[PDB]
């Protein structure tokens, strides 16, 4: 699988985004879909994912309540809906393929989007 992220961008705390990532030469089916976040010095970070084509989400302890995870009908796009935001949320976020089973370390996706920036000023 080929991901891009788009969605991204610069707004002030408490606004949304909308992060999708989409999938080239094949859907998403048989693959755990997963997003993660780099923040300026800091490692890569699980953020959320989505597997079994939805029987499973994930979501960070930092994060949950406030972005949802969802995929299409045609499972081409995985989507990140991001509310409530606030400045620490700020990062390159990242768009996550893997086959096999929905684990929260970066080390074992396979396929990787080139990112996408999130800014979130106060």
């Known amino acids: 699988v080929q991901l891009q992220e788009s969605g991204g961008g610069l707004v002030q705390a408490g606004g949304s985004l909308r992060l999708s990532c989409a999938a080239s030469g094949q859907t998403f089916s048989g693959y755990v879909t997963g997003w993660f976040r780099q923040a300026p010095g800091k490692e890569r970070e699980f953020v959320a994912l989505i597997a079994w084509s939805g029987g499973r989400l994930y979501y960070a302890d930092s994060v949950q309540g406030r972005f949802t995870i969802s995929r299409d009908n045609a499972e081409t796009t995985v989507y990140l809906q991001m509310n409530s935001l606030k400045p620490e949320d700020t990062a390159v976020y990242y768009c996550?393929?893997?086959?096999?089973?929905?684990?929260?370390?970066?080390?074992?996706?396979?396929?990787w989007g080139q990112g996408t920036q999130v800014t979130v000023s106060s």
């Open positions: 996550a393929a893997k086959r096999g089973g929905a684990v929260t370390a970066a080390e074992w996706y396979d396929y």
